[PDB]
Amino acid sequence: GTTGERPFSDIITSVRYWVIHSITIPALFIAGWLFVSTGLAYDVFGTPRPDSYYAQEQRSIPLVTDRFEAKQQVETFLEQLK
Amino acid sequence: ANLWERFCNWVTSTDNRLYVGWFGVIMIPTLLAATICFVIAFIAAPPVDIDGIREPVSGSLLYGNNIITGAVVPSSNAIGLHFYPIWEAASLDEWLYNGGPYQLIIFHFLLGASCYMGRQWELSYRLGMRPWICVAYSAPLASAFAVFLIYPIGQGSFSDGMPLGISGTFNFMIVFQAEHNILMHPFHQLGVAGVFGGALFCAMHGSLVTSSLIRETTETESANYGYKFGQEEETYNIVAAHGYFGRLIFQYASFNNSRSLHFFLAAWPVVGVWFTALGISTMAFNLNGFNFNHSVIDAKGNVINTWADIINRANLGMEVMHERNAHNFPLDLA
Amino acid sequence: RGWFDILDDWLKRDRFVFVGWSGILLFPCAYLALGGWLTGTTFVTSWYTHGLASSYLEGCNFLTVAVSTPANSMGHSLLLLWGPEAQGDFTRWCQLGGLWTFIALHGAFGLIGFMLRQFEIARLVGVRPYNAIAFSAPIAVFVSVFLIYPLGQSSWFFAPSFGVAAIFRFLLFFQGFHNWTLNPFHMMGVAGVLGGALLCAIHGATVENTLFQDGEGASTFRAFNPTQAEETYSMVTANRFWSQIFGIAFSNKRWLHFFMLFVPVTGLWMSAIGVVGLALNLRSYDFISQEIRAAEDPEFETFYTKNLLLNEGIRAWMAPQDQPHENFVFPEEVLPRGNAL
Amino acid sequence: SYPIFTVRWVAVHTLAVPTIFFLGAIAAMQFIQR
Amino acid sequence: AELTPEVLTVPLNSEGKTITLTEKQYLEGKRLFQYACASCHVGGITKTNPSLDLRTETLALATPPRDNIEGLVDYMKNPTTYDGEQEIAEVHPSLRSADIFPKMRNLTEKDLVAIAGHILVEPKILGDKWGGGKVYY
Amino acid sequence: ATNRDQESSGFAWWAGNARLINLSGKLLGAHVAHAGLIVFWAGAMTLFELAHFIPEKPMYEQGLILIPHIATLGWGVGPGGEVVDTFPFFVVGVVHLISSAVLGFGGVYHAIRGPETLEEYSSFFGYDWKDKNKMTTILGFHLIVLGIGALLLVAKAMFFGGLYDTWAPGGGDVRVITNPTLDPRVIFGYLLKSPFGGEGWIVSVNNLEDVVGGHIWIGLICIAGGIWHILTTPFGWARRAFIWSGEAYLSYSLGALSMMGFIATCFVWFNNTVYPSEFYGPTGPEASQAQAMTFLIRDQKLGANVGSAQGPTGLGKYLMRSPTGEIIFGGETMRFWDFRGPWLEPLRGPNGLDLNKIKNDIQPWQERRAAEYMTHAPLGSLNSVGGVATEINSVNFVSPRSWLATSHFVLAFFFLVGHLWHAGRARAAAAGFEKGIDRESEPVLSMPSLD
Ligand code: CLA
Ligand code: CLA
Ligand code: CLA
Ligand code: CLA
Ligand SMILES: CC1=C(/C=C/C(C)=C/C=C/C(C)=C/C=C/C=C(C)/C=C/C=C(C)/C=C/C2=C(C)CCCC2(C)C)C(C)(C)CCC1
Ligand SMILES: CC1=C(/C=C/C(C)=C/C=C/C(C)=C/C=C/C=C(C)/C=C/C=C(C)/C=C/C2=C(C)CCCC2(C)C)C(C)(C)CCC1
Ligand SMILES: CCCCCCCCCCCCCCCCCC(=O)O
Ligand code: OEY
Ligand SMILES: [Cl-]
Ligand SMILES: [Cl-]
Ligand SMILES: [Fe+2]
């Protein structure tokens, strides 16, 4: 039977549906695009940019080797990039 | 009627306990020859120079194997794809040394298995059934052709066919990964979806029919006696099963057509295993899994390893150690 | 009515997506496990834990993205966001591997919630809870592989990472270090999964090709009414087909569908048991009698010894980069290699 | 006379709107140069 | 790390003069190196003679020295054995043998220099990986 | 609603082309429009290949599968397989693409506007699947068309500029064929060769004379068979043996196509005569043999005595004997000793590879071809990274022999499945139980119990 909600086939074909979503969908797409193009996703998650994996002359990986000094360890690695 | 017609009626008789049929006329002698040779070779056959380098691998129980390590060993690389019947050898001893039983077994077997498929069609016709059970069997049969026939063809040697053994299968799988990166090949990823999904949907459908069995027994007896062989009624409430499973997910993720539901059970693992058979068959021609080795580099050009580069380090370990004495030149082109 | 009874009413309302009491556990944890995996494969690195890029943002594709395991120096830490390692710092949390425990632990409880949902919905509709029972095998697998196995090892580092190629690395690790193909519990696992897929295909095919003609069309799907009483295919003709083709056949439909439950479920349970052993490195790695003979007899060779040579290749060639915290330095000359290659 | 805001509404939007956001993010990534 | 001009600075000649390439010439030399040389030289080794790689130390001990742009350009015109004693244009691609090695025909003097720079710049980035073979993959 | 719906035609939308089984005009339209797509693709692809073609690179480095088919026929190519004039490629492409428009026009005309069934408009073009006379007649016509097409290849080789002959003295060239092989002991000998190693059934054909000769026989056989079927109707043993229905005829062809797909697969992988390695890249065996040759040469140059170099296993490091004694390259390539190629045969004497010729007669062009082929072995990844699975990114290469073999195995396999599907259905349909078992007369229920 029917649990009482409006049928999806009815909603997506409705004009009012697309009036609302001709904006929200492209707006959300643009918001995500901006999230990366501003470089903001690097800083929120601590992901290296292509230039910040190694120091200029090092080939060693900044692997964290301590449980409780780990947050301190990562920050020390980040300042040897400058 | 005359003798030929009496024979034909017997051959095609639907009253034989096991159906014979025209396919069975080929299937029985070939499956018997293959089976008898397999059993004797697995127990007693002496060591086989699989890689053609005069370094025989012992495959049989009497020569120090157990059930897990034993195998009928593929025929010698010196033979490549040449036909090596018993009568081409100078002696059975020579035939044993070079891995003759492997050719005899797999050819008789592939022939008989093909006829098994055809026999499935044949009895379905005498019985008045729809004919496509044999299509379902074509997925495992194609898989068998892939590893025993197609892959030795494209690599040019039966010595690179799959061994008839438990440990030899794993040897085949590991060498295959190193040379084709089969894990990174989507037809194998399709085959995993095919069998994982098959097992899932097996458990689902079994659990869902079992869940909606109609009470026809008391608690001191097996519910299986609630079903009588040949009964016209169904023994479970498919509406109840839909009602349960539709609420478990949502109403339209659930089947209510038994025929649709059952065809889906047939189609999912068959298609997936078709693809994995096609995966072995096309990697026989060295169209391998995706290669993302050093795909990620940084601003300077340093390689930034991904999980694919780790997989490559395991592949390289399998590459350099497999058939350790067999290669004289830096590339392993087949 | 009490407030409890009224909340019970609304949780159990018949709606497009049933909620229930179990939903309070299921939907938050399943969504957050899902979301954390998406978030991490899109944006999060494994640079400081593994020396690996692991996200779309770093230029990985769908097969090579992963939420990777924490660094080995974390041991078995819960890696709480507010715990001593990250100290509430979300960015450092991602960098230290916290999304892995985030996904693993929320997913554990999500799986608990889903099973309770199966119990809850079965209880309300009125059917026996065999579906919930069958779902014990996925849970046994998840718990043994993602939780028990690393808890027996040195750290979460060696649990599986959540990614397509990461799981492939896991497979190959188990071959080279554990000789897992040789394990009888995995072999039973393989028999149950391959056997399940077989039963799925053969039963589906058998039903489709013993249908009764209940309509006039060539598409036979419309000739089935879900309220009909009669069986839609011939159990008698199927039984005779298979008796004459294969020698035996099912004759009891109830045993047939219980067997379909039993086979894949029992298979996964058996593999779970084997991985618990591997938590302790309690492997079926060797056959002693073969090793005693091989060591004394340089002409004795089987597929067993050949595969151990392959295992030694995997370990030595993959360890330095796969366990970077160990600082393995293997000069070229110690690497095991056959001729030429 | 159907409602517009249902539990179902929350369900599709808990999934759909993050999905679209993530797609635009992944789209932009294809133009990152090293 | 990034591709800086210090990285992009390589010996012009044996006499010690250097030259600084642009990012464009580096990428150009890599594309062309793939086009005309990688089939045998992928990653700095030599598939058809693994005893000779493209490591700078190796190029240095060649006769004449090959660890500089002019030395490499000269090799791609008139290649010789490691000791300079024989000319190998008949079995090694070069401008001298662009009739038998057709991929060399369209190449120009700027192209050979870009390829030479790529070869000389690449072990500065990759280290042991360049010319080390599968051990360092 | 002329069929076009499930209720009237009996077939659901996903099996909709089965609504066409007894609409010969609408069916004719489908076949001609589909032929339009085949000719279209042949046209567009060649022009695509021509747009992307760089004549200084080998064809097999450029992802070409159609231009190699034109070059093999003698057009646009000179000694050594060097490309001299790209204009015939352009002609072949343009002419196919133009034709697809007229094919496509006639297909869309017949499928949409034309008469749905041909039988009332014309007794010659209309047909009934069960008319065993009309069916062998149409078969006969298409046989003649096929024999003619086979003779077109003969016309090209003997009268219209010849064919590319990889075996031609001096490194390969276009060559008029003047003495095709007519001796039927040779032509039909090929059909009786074993398909196993060192024999190769028809895949072993290694000279253009046998190729042109066999196409004379086939062209004449097809023309004569077409006449035979135009004039005759099937005999009684044939009438009792076959199912005479549209679907049955479909299934016979599906099986036939499947068989041919598997043979083509093996042809493109092993044969280097009608798939010249100059255009298609080396075969798998060829590249592996070329590796052993490369390192024989390098080491012999350094002073090694290659004939007496005992390898690690006790077998010769460079040279050893096949099981029938021929001298062959050693190492794993021992499996490939059946390989034959223009660059290697000069080193062959009566006992196999000749050690004197190896020590003295190896020319720089052989060292070049052997190095080129070893480095273009048909190994490579799905994203076209060339080499073994463990190679790093750099070389963007997959051999067209790999592309052509793998694609046609897949197609050949799925057409075998299609054969089984339609053959079993055609049988069940002809007997009247393709829609299921009749409840009121279930055949099994009228049989004795097995036990
Ligand atoms: C597209 C090609 C084609 C097709 C589909 C047919 C189809 C048919 N032909 Mg025609 N035919 C053709 C081409 C074709 N023919 C050509 C080119 C010739 C000239 C040689 C003939 C000459 C010919 C004659 C003389 C006769 C037919 C007959 C028939 C009918 C019986 C078919 C039969 O029994 O199959 C074959 C199935 C069998 C069981 C027969 C045994 C064949 C064995 C099993 C195969 C092995 C032998 C093989 C021929 C050679 C070995 C090759 C091997 C190495 C691979 C059928 C309608 C018969 C008929 O009714 O005529 C009106 C008949 O008498 N055909
Ligand atoms: C279904 C609900 C649910 C469940 C089971 C979990 C479970 C978990 N989450 Mg998740 N979480 C949820 C929803 C949920 N979460 C939601 C909705 C969000 C988004 C805001 C998050 C965001 C989130 C983050 C960001 C993190 C977790 C983390 C955790 C873990 C640690 C939890 C902890 O220490 O709690 C401690 C708190 C309690 C156990 C609650 C105690 C309640 C009271 C005080 C007890 C005393 C009662 C009193 C004495 C008697 C009352 C009687 C009554 C009659 C009144 C655990 C796996 C962490 C994790 O995964 O680490 C890796 C982590 O970092 N969660
Ligand atoms: C090779 C592909 C191919 C071809 C040639 C056909 C051909 C045909 N189909 Mg099949 N079909 C196909 C694929 C194909 N189909 C697939 C993939 C499906 C599954 C979705 C179906 C499902 C299907 C069903 C369910 C039915 C058919 C039917 C038909 C027939 C009539 C169609 C009709 O009335 O359309 C009318 C449509 C239109 C008038 C719209 C425009 C159609 C034209 C042809 C488009 C041409 C575009 C092109 C650019 C023109 C270039 C012009 C240029 C040359 C000048 C026709 C002979 C019908 C049938 O059997 O009739 C009884 C029918 O019921 N087909
Ligand atoms: C094999 C394909 C094929 C077949 C069997 C038919 C059959 C038919 N068509 Mg169709 N048609 C086709 C292709 C085909 N057509 C194509 C490609 C087009 C577009 C150009 C048309 C356009 C078309 C129209 C517009 C009409 C028909 C009509 C007809 C009917 C009578 C035609 C007639 O007798 O002409 C007489 C035959 C001749 C004069 C013989 C000469 C034909 C050419 C010049 C011979 C070329 C052969 C060539 C050498 C072979 C190689 C070709 C290629 C492989 C290179 C008949 C049912 C008519 C009909 O029934 O509608 C009411 C109609 O009005 N057809
Ligand atoms: C029926 C049908 C169908 C089908 C259809 C079809 C199949 C069709 C086809 C069609 C076709 C098949 C068409 C064709 C077309 C073509 C054309 C249109 C061409 C053109 C050409 C040109 C124009 C060219 C040009 C040029 C030149 C000349 C030179 C160079 C450059 C160029 C290229 C530009 C469908 C399924 C859909 C649907 C249903 C029905
Ligand atoms: C061109 C060429 C050539 C030639 C070729 C030829 C000459 C061919 C021929 C061909 C042929 C000559 C073929 C044949 C075929 C056959 C077949 C394929 C058969 C089939 C059959 C069938 C199928 C049958 C079946 C059946 C039975 C058995 C029983 C009953 C039922 C039935 C009928 C079904 C050569 C190589 C030199 C070279 C290159 C080129
Ligand atoms: C000394 C360190 C201080 C760190 C303070 C900042 C940390 C705040 C984290 C808040 C996370 C809230 C989600 C946790 C609730 C989920 C557990 C549950 O609901 O059962
Ligand atoms: O892996 Mn590696 O590649 Ca196919 O051959 Mn060359 O070596 Mn050997 O014989 Mn068995 O196997
Ligand atoms: Cl091995
Ligand atoms: Cl070798
Ligand atoms: Fe069932």
Residue numbers in the entry:
A (entry chain e): 3 to 84
B (entry chain a): 11 to 344
C (entry chain d): 12 to 352
D (entry chain f): 12 to 45
E (entry chain v): 1 to 137
F (entry chain c): 23 to 473
From the paper:
Specifically, a slight elongation of the O5 density toward W2 and a slight elongation of the W4 density toward W3 are observed at 250 μs. The Ox omit density becomes asymmetric starting at 250 μs, with a clear reduction in intensity after 500 μs and dropping to the noise level between 1,200 and 2,000 μs, and Ox can only be modeled with a population of less than 20% in the 2,000 μs time point. At 250 μs, the D1-E65 residue rotates by 19° toward W40, resulting in shortening the distance between D1-E65 and W40 by 0.3 Å. This is the time point when the Ox density starts to become asymmetric, which is even more pronounced at 500 μs. We observed the start of the rotation of D1-E65, which is proposed to be part of the proton gate, and the formation of the hydrogen bond pathway from the OEC to this region at 250 μs. The Yzox formation triggers the first deprotonation event likely during the time period of 200–500 μs15–17,24,34,39.
